[PDB]
Amino acid sequence: ARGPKKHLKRVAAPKHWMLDKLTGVFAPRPSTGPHKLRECLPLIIFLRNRLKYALTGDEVKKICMQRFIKIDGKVRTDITYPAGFMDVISIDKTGENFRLIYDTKGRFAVHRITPEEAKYKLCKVRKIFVGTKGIPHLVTHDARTIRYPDPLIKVNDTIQIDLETGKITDFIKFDTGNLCMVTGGANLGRIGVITNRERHPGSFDVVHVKDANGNSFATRLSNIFVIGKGNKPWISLPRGKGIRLTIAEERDKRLAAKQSSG
Amino acid sequence: GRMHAPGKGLSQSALPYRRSVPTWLKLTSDDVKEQIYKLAKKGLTPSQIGVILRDSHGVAQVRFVTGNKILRILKSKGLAPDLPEDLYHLIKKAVAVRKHLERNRKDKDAKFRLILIESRIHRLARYYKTKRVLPPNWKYESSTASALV
Amino acid sequence: GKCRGLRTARKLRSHRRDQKWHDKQYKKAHLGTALKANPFGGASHAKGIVLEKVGVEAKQPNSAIRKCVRVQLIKNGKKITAFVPNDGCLNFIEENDEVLVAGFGRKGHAVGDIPGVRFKVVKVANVSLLALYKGKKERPR
Amino acid sequence: VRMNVLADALKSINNAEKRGKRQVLIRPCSKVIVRFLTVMMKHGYIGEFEIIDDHRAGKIVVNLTGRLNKCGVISPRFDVQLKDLEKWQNNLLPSRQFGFIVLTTSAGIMDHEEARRKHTGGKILGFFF
Amino acid sequence: ADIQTERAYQKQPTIFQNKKRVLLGETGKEKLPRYYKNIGLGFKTPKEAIEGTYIDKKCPFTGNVSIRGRILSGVVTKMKMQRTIVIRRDYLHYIRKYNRFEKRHKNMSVHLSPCFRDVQIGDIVTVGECRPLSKTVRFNVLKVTKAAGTK
């Protein structure tokens, strides 16, 4: 190429968007924003494919630029605006609130939340640095810079932040025995408590996590988002509680649900 | 089978299972060692030392009665030649055949046997230089043959 | 005997490479001289211009006189001799007609009956000999 | 010259048992030979054997039974990963019931079933059916 | 002085050689402070780098390089260049058609710091990846061990 790309082919789109093959040759191509291209759900896919208020992209544009959709309390009219993990979507006209968090299968669940839960969000701290005139700054996973954080907050810790103002309100350390959710890799969407973090200098750390059913799985340190302190999550969880069922028990649950109703 | 002779004999020595020294041998290990010392002073190779000790002094195996084999015994007090006895015998044989060739030029069999002997010399010298018995600069030359004897 | 050493892959590869070069189908398909010397240029059919009409004598145990066309190919200027299915079909062929020609059928090999012919006439004047011989189509001039 | 004494032992056992013999003498002994013969013995193929100790590499006298058809070595000792076993047995054992690939693994000398059970691979030595 | 063998003045850029000192310090000892650091991956900075006098901007311990990326090994094969050596890495490549192996090799030109003396042909060298230092060198010597057969 001679410069940056503007198009996303539909088969080359992220698979967890759940787009089909025959609607077009193109996928909605997320704008630049606080989330990566491969780790976000654009607003057009949310309002059309998942939530089904709209039937076309033109109807998505008509919804969005009537100024109805807030992402983290800010009105967005970009139809391809990249929304990602822990982002709060508020529709004040229909009175709906959502958090973009993952299913046990690694797809952004339609997770409805309470309007008091939509006041805040959680962020994973990605860097701590001191800037000019000795002013400490943190940078989160969603491109937020906060000046003057708590001196106890470190990288990989999780801040509980207020969307009305944007300041630090509470925080959770990275420690063995805290609750976490996996935001990348093969264990995307699973939830469990951290049991062992092994360190590899000059390389990636590997965190071992144990499920509430006793299953154990490892990930990298980049894929760990600490959610709750010890055992109780600080946000609402989806219908599955991070418990990945195997295909056998999922078939059994489907058959029992078909037997009970019908 | 042999290296270069196509014949494959069996004749060798069969050591008995009994490693213990027999009771009738009243000689001690020390007296065996000074027997080795006089025998080496008489200008004897280790093979001849073992042969005379077996034939006359009743020593079945020096390694069974003294705990070491004869070359190590000669090496402890330095009564050991610079180069081993098999290489020495190949070199003497090469000098003898070469002198016969100098007298007799129509003996092509002696020329072929000389090639065979020199091939043995080269292979065994390679082996010894691998195990540091010979210095790495040592080489067999046809003219540097009578000086080693 | 062949070597079976676990660290002998390079020797096995080199030997198989040379011994593949001793295979005649491999040599034809990979050396390339078979396709440079082929009159068809490696293709399945070829168009030509009919130069003359000749008669080639058949084999000795089944004596006959078969009739052939001497045709110069268009794309390389090579001369070949092509077979006509019978003498009735030859009356549709005249000197200077554009003729589409295929191979005889045994993959580059000549006939077991007619010595030294490898090509058969398929079309003349953009109509097939089967359509002319069956009265399905007529040819222009 | 005499390389791969396990090959020579297995060839001697096969040749003696095809002539309908009751005992076979194999020399020289080896620990790999003894573990291979133990693997055969625990499956009831070669009766019971005895090691004769001279102060050299010893000899083994094996009391042949008759249930064996062919025992064989796979030379060289190919690396056998835990998947390749099915491939290897479909190349070596004429059926799914009887026949044995013997593996030298980090857990010792075993057959392919016990190799699967302990979840490991190794290097292939031989087979007997 | 075994240091100023070039046409420009060789010095470590981080140390200052013109401190204004008293006469008693002048008559005390004439030793320059030396800049050194650790290649921190369990690699020990050698004493010949800490107490030495040489100037090498491409030295891992006293220069201006950082070690990040791969860490490999080789055997020293040629030592005829200036502050760089040519090592050899041997390996086995698996041809899966034959299920066999062939032996292959790669030659690698690495920078040898002056703090490693008595480096012989055949000794095992551990190199770490740095930024490009010349056209063909990308790795930098971090450890030397002698061959196991040599006393």
Place this chain on the structure above:
RNA sequence: CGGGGAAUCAGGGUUCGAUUCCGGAGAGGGAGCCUGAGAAACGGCUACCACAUCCAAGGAAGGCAGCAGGCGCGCAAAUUA
């Protein structure tokens, strides 16, 4: 052009991958720039080479390996919707 891949299929292999996805390269052949965050850009510019359009003979303009379409080439491939 390379891969993802395709045919076969007991297994190993053998043949194919110009071609819709990913990466690269090029815009007749070379070369050099301007502008711009980004191009050594060709549905930008400036030369030379090869072709080639108009002309009142002074001059001016060019680049379908984009969509259609044409000629040529050929055994070989669609509508100027």
Place this chain on the structure above:
RNA sequence: AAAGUUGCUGCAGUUAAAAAGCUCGUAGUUGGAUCUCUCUCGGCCGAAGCGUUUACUUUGAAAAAAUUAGAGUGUUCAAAGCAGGCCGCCUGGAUACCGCAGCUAGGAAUAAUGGAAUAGGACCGCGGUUCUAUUUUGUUGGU
């Protein structure tokens, strides 16, 4: 593809294609038997040296979709598709494979490799020589 007529699996070379007059003779390939975890600082444990290094084997992480295999679903069936189903509600959009190489943590059979025999070899203590303590000479000059 039949084809074991390119043969690693898996071919042949007396008489049919084909083994060299004979011996010596680099490299490469291949090579008999044998050998059954700990020390410091911090809360039974964590850091550290590893134990000769490998080759080998296993685990863990990480690894585009499409295609392939494969789960669900009466496209009227099917090739397909990713849908749908029930009287607003209830669901899906699984899963496997993903050589090699490289990271990770185990295994020690197999096969190399090394560790003392001119002993300037281990384990202890007694040490002598040289360099060297960052502090226990309130603040300091210190031989």
